[PDB]
Amino acid sequence: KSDVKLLGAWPSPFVMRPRIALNIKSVEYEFLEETLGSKSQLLLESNPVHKKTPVLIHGGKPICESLVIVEYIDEVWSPGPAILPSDPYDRALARFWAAYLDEKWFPTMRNIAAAKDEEARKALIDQVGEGLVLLEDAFSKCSKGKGFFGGDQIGYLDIAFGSFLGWLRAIEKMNGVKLMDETRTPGLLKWANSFSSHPAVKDVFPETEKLVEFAKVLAK
Ligand SMILES: N[C@@H](CCC(=O)N[C@@H](CS)C(=O)NCC(=O)O)C(=O)O
Numbered sequence: 001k002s003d004v005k006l007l008g009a010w011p012s013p014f015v016m017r018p019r020i021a022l023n024i025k026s027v028e029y030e031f032l033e034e035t036l037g038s039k040s041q042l043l044l045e046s047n048p049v050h051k052k053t054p055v056l057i058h059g060g061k062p063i064c065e066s067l068v069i070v071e072y073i074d075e076v077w078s079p080g081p082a083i084l085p086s087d088p089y090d091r092a093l094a095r096f097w098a099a100y101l102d103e104k105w106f107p108t109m110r111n112i113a114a115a116k117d118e119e120a121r122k123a124l125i126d127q128v129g130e131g132l133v134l135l136e137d138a139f140s141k142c143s144k145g146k147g148f149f150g151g152d153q154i155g156y157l158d159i160a161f162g163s164f165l166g167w168l169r170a171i172e173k174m175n176g177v178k179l180m181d182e183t184r185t186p187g188l189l190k191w192a193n194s195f196s197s198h199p200a201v202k203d204v205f206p207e208t209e210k211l212v213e214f215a216k217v218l219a220k
Pocket of ligand 1: 008009010011012013014015034039051052053054064065066067
């Protein structure tokens with residue numbers, strides 16, 4: 001257990017990602033929580049560039065950046081189920097969409113909370129909605145009618161996108177908007193249950209109300 005350590009704030013969509021990947025690979029690990037109010041020495045020494053989590057420590061050796069960590073886990077524990085797609089083009093598409101999520105979509109939805117007016121706030125909600133339209137189409141293309149972005153089995157892009165699901169639901173609730181519905185994102189609605197119910201996910205997947213109540217705690 002001790003030769004695999006995961007440094008992580010909790011709850012966090014980025015920290016969830018390697019927990020799921022480690023679950024898929026049936027890998028034994030110790031979870032070292034970063035607590036509010038302080039950055040640990042281990043953190044400051046493991047991730048001096050960004051001073052954030054997750055950090056996977058594999059043999060006293062730090063791997064930073066959640067998506068990089070998921071690929072590392074997939075490559076090292078190659079015995080287990082595959083996380084990335086096997087085909088180069090499918091892998092490129094999965095990486096493209098995970099990058100879009102982290103660079104454009106999630107930052108936009110995280111900015112809703114800080115908008116300075118109702119005008120600008122709905123502008124962001126509309127963009128988050130449009131992004132979900134794009135992701136619904138990506139899901140159709142990636143899944144091929146099977147259950148996940150990865151196809152029959154959960155995959156890299158399921159982990160990247162699904163890790164945000166609890167925060168999407170909390171932002172939906174606290175803004176009184178419905179961004180996933182059966183009209184605009186029918187496939188994602190179904191996948192959201194497939195993902196949250198998955199045995200590699202369900203025990204690390206946040207209750208929506210908990211995230212809402214937690215958002216309220218952070219307001220400081
Ligand atoms: N982009 C990073 C995640 C960045 C991030 O914002 N991490 C926060 C989420 S709460 C965190 O827990 N950082 C550790 C800390 O602040 O103590 C990744 O993909 O690895």
